[PDB]
Amino acid sequence: LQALARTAISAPLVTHLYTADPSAHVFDGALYIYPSHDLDHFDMADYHVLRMAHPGAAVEDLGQVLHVRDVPWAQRQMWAPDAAQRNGKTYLYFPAKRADGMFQIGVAVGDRPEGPFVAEPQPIAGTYSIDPAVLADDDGAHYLYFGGIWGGQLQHYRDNAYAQTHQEPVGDAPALGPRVARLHERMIDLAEPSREVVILDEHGTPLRADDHARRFFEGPWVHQHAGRYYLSYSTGDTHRICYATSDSPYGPFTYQGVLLAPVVGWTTHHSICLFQQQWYLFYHDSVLSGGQTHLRSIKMAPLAHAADGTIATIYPYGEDAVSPW
Ligand SMILES: [Ca+2]
């Protein structure tokens, strides 16, 4: 697979550290990226913030802005984060693991996009599992999406309650979807208990647990375009970013297709962000590290919505490349 490094459509945004799970936002007139920081096993411990001043600019590492040692409730595994702004504050949302082994989502508050961020002493009540994404709705509301199965533990929850015997559904049972909750105006609490986000097939039927090509695995992201909501996410063991659409941030979302073909390294994770004239897909892969799943680099590619609202598949090493998966 050494050909893939040669025909990659994107270079690593930074190479002096390993980065993953990019959440891109335009805050205060610039592009800010909030990724995970892979350490040279997914044992990440801290977050950096990166910035691009304008379209085409060199990427700045603004340095470390939060470390798990400053998060009283969390012991380890600072995974895919996100950020939001409200009332002149910037909020850093992040999944991390408690000493008792459970993932939950917490938040840290700062006065600027680049921090420093001060972590709340407890996680956000009502959250669990991983991969937060916070949608700043055009109407002023903020919504928190989250969830990931397998290592993300979402499969142990139903209706927001944990049980040891809750497992991943199988067969004809509906696959699990991400969770969503409107955030409180104070941003560090939910305004409501989270709800299931339902993803439907083209016939209006919820996706099956045994449909691993399409069913939700982790890393939800929502963006607005042309009066609809786009939910996009990783399918995990089939290595796709897929997307689905709805007239509501709550769904249900109807499956549309594959947004990003498989990348090098087992995980795939992304965000979609509008910057000046252009939509961009931010994603990651493991080429920098020579194909090591746990050492990634974030990347970006331009993204286009078609007249009919669809998004064409992005092929990270070219459409003619041998797929890494
Ligand atoms: Ca994410």
Side-chain angles (χ1 to χ4, degrees), residues 199-269:
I199 306 174
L200 302 174
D201 67 17
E202 49 299 346
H203 306 324
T205 302
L207 296 181
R208 296 164 57 112
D210 62 15
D211 182 5
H212 293 201
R214 300 192 292 178
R215 71 109 172 76
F216 172 81
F217 183 95
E218 79 176 289
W221 182 270
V222 176
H223 79 270
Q224 294 182 270
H225 169 73
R228 27 191 174 266
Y229 296 86
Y230 288 69
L231 166 70
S232 52
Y233 56 90
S234 165
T235 64
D237 60 339
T238 56
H239 301 274
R240 305 153 147 217
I241 306 293
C242 287
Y243 73 107
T245 55
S246 188
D247 298 334
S248 162
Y250 287 103
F253 289 81
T254 299
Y255 179 84
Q256 298 294 320
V258 176
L259 187 156
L260 181 70
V263 296
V264 168
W266 196 95
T267 70
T268 187
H269 202 110

Side-chain angles (χ1 to χ4, degrees), residues 21-23 80-82 131-133 219-221 269-270:
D21 313 322
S23 292
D82 199 8
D131 298 358
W221 182 270
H269 202 110
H270 81 301

Side-chain angles (χ1 to χ4, degrees), residues 39 122 149:
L39 304 178
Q122 314 189 311
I149 59 172

Side-chain angles (χ1 to χ4, degrees), residues 307-322:
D308 68 352
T310 59
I311 303 172
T313 304
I314 298 168
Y315 292 91
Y317 313 103
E319 183 163 1
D320 286 336
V322 171

Side-chain angles (χ1 to χ4, degrees), residues 7 16 42 77 99 102 108 130 137 159 173 178 235 238 251 255 276-278 280:
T7 70
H16 62 278
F42 292 124
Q77 292 184 312
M102 302 285 88
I130 59 169
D137 196 302
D159 295 313
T235 64
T238 56
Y255 179 84
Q276 305 200 4
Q277 295 163 262
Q278 170 79 238
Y280 294 88

Side-chain angles (χ1 to χ4, degrees), residues 11-313:
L13 286 178
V14 292
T15 58
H16 62 278
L17 73 176
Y18 291 111
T19 49
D21 313 322
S23 292
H25 295 266
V26 178
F27 292 153
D28 295 309
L31 189 61
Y32 287 82
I33 304 165
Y34 299 83
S36 306
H37 176 193
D38 290 331
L39 304 178
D40 193 351
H41 56 286
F42 292 124
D43 207 16
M44 307 103 77
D46 68 86
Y47 300 116
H48 287 223
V49 178
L50 315 174
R51 179 171 64 202
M52 296 179 35
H54 54 256
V59 176
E60 315 162 64
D61 178 5
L62 306 180
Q64 191 187 282
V65 300
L66 182 67
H67 190 287
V68 69
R69 81 167 64 88
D70 291 312
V71 184
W73 63 267
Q75 180 176 67
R76 58 186 194 108
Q77 292 184 312
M78 300 275 268
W79 284 8
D82 199 8
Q85 285 190 327
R86 200 189 199 275
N87 303 119
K89 307 279 167 174
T90 301
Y91 299 88
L92 182 60
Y93 298 82
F94 63 95
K97 194 168 276 175
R98 310 192 313 248
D100 69 3
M102 302 285 88
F103 274 122
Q104 203 158 345
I105 291 153
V107 67
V109 193
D111 284 313
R112 320 161 328 166
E114 67 262 62
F117 290 94
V118 180
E120 298 292 336
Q122 314 189 311
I124 303 173
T127 66
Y128 45 93
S129 186
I130 59 169
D131 298 358
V134 175
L135 171 70
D137 196 302
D138 285 334
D139 70 11
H142 283 85
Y143 296 92
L144 173 70
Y145 299 84
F146 59 99
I149 59 172
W150 293 23
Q153 307 178 338
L154 179 61
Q155 66 278 17
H156 297 304
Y157 294 83
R158 300 288 190 281
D159 295 313
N160 300 318
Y162 173 81
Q164 295 186 28
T165 66
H166 279 156
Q167 302 293 341
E168 188 182 326
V170 300
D172 68 327
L176 297 171
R179 309 298 300 192
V180 61
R182 187 172 66 81
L183 291 166
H184 192 279
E185 62 185 342
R186 67 190 282 175
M187 292 293 284
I188 65 171
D189 290 303
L190 308 184
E192 71 191 332
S194 84
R195 321 186 192 169
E196 181 85 343
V197 175
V198 176
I199 306 174
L200 302 174
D201 67 17
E202 49 299 346
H203 306 324
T205 302
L207 296 181
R208 296 164 57 112
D210 62 15
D211 182 5
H212 293 201
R214 300 192 292 178
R215 71 109 172 76
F216 172 81
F217 183 95
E218 79 176 289
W221 182 270
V222 176
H223 79 270
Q224 294 182 270
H225 169 73
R228 27 191 174 266
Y229 296 86
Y230 288 69
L231 166 70
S232 52
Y233 56 90
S234 165
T235 64
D237 60 339
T238 56
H239 301 274
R240 305 153 147 217
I241 306 293
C242 287
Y243 73 107
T245 55
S246 188
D247 298 334
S248 162
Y250 287 103
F253 289 81
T254 299
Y255 179 84
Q256 298 294 320
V258 176
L259 187 156
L260 181 70
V263 296
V264 168
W266 196 95
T267 70
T268 187
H269 202 110
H270 81 301
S271 58
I272 294 170
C273 179
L274 182 67
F275 192 18
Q276 305 200 4
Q277 295 163 262
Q278 170 79 238
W279 286 99
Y280 294 88
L281 173 72
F282 290 77
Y283 60 104
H284 73 225
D285 72 17
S286 292
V287 172
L288 182 58
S289 70
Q292 296 176 261
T293 285
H294 82 285
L295 300 173
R296 298 155 294 180
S297 76
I298 67 175
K299 293 179 163 188
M300 65 184 300
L303 180 152
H305 301 85
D308 68 352
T310 59
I311 303 172
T313 304

